[PDB]
Amino acid sequence: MEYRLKAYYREGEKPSALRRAGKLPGVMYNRHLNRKVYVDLVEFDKVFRQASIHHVIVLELPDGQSLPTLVRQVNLDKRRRRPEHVDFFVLSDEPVEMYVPLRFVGTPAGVRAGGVLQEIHRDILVKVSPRNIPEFIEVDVSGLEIGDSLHASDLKLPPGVELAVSPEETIAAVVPPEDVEKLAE
Amino acid sequence: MKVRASVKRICDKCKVIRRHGRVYVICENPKHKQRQG
Amino acid sequence: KKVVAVVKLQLPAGKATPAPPVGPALGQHGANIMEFVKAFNAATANMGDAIVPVEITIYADRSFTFVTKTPPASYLIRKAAGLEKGAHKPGREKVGRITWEQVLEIAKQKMPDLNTTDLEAAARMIAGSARSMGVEVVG
């Protein structure tokens, strides 16, 4: 849950040359720094598929530095469903704005009754110190029946960790379930 | 024998064979007998 | 003069007519087939209902021999929870209830039929058999 990934420095190499040779063009930045980097596709993919934009990844640069980051954006080539480039946010002791996995706890009274829980948000936006990223945030959705929902305004929130979006924003809902009976009409 | 462009395993004993350039399906049940054609 | 057989039946209470399975598999006994109407409804006429199991053996001079078990899990529990039937849909509607120590005494009725020979093991069988029907156990 505190990931590492090798990360090297590119200068003038073509993104195409790189992408070809199994590597992933990328950039790492923050308000003090900006640097063009590549990672091995397959290695990033292994990490990233667990980490996502949620958990720190740590960049082992050839120079020996050990940058601790967050994946900010990841550009996909739309034709091939694949990653072309990654944005690496280099974290700092200041608090930071980022995304927290929401784990939905419990089975609703609306599921189990025929229907369906639509997790609108699977995570949420959060202002927070890097030093306390709550790798999780549990929400109880057992009280939800069909036609019921749940907004940010709920949501327990460890400390601290304040929200970062309107609490007016809805986050899960239970909606009714595709009926073949509903069909003929 | 069934003769179609879609030859498939129909039940759990259905067997897919390649014979003399042709894909067949062969099975205990004889309705299942396909030939690709 | 038909063979030595080991027959296994399941007939309920009352209906003691010599029709299948009391006929083809029972002709091989030369059975006093109607001696069961009276030698069965004599342990089950104070009771009335209850399927009571039975094994019927024949030998070499054409006579029959049968010995019975004890009324079903599902049966014993139905007349302890104020019920005629089960619960239609096991899950959302319980139509009776039973304490931890009324299942034990039901578990004490079925003690010489089972796999275990215990009470805590046995009563959870009764307990699982209450979930099978949808009658909550008064715990």
């Binding site: 990233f48 739309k78 469903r81 599921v111 025929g114 595709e178 009926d179 | - | -």
Partner: protein, 141 residues
């Protein structure tokens, strides 16, 4: 089936299928997705069939989302007339789709269930289409 409630204009010129999906490329709602492998005006009765497939599979049921909507009116001249005398009569609606688009999404359903539905839905469509499942890459968008 599907079509616009209202339109600013009733017939439109034909345009062109160059290129990958403009957007709409990542899964947003459900757990599984059906992505178009090729360009095609998918027609509404098509979309509709695909839906009906999946509800019929699920029976009851989960949730199907539809991410393409047919809003291009399709013209056609009446049979056996000649060129000229104006543009033809709108006959139905279609949705312009380019490879990488996610067309339909499913949620609340077994993994076996999803794939099989999606398999069927593809069969009702005039193009290649791989099934996809929600990833990290999707939620990074």
């Amino acid at each position: 089936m599907l079509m616009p409630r209202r339109m600013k204009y009733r017939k439109q010129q034909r345009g062109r299928l160059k290129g990958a999906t403009k957007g709409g490329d990542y899964v947003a709602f459900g757990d599984y997705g059906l992505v178009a492998l090729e360009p095609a005006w998918i027609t509404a009765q098509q979309i509709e069939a695909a839906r009906v497939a999946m509800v019929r599979h699920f029976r009851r049921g989960g949730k199907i989302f539809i991410r393409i909507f047919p809003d291009k009116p399709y013209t056609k001249k009446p049979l056996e007339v000649r060129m000229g005398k104006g543009k033809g009569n709108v006959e139905g609606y279609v949705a312009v789709v380019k490879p990488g688009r996610v067309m339909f999404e499913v949620a609340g359903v077994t993994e076996e269930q999803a794939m099989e539905a999606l398999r069927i839905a593809g069969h009702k469509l005039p193009i290649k289409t791989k099934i996809v499942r929600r990833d990290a890459y999707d939620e990074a968008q």
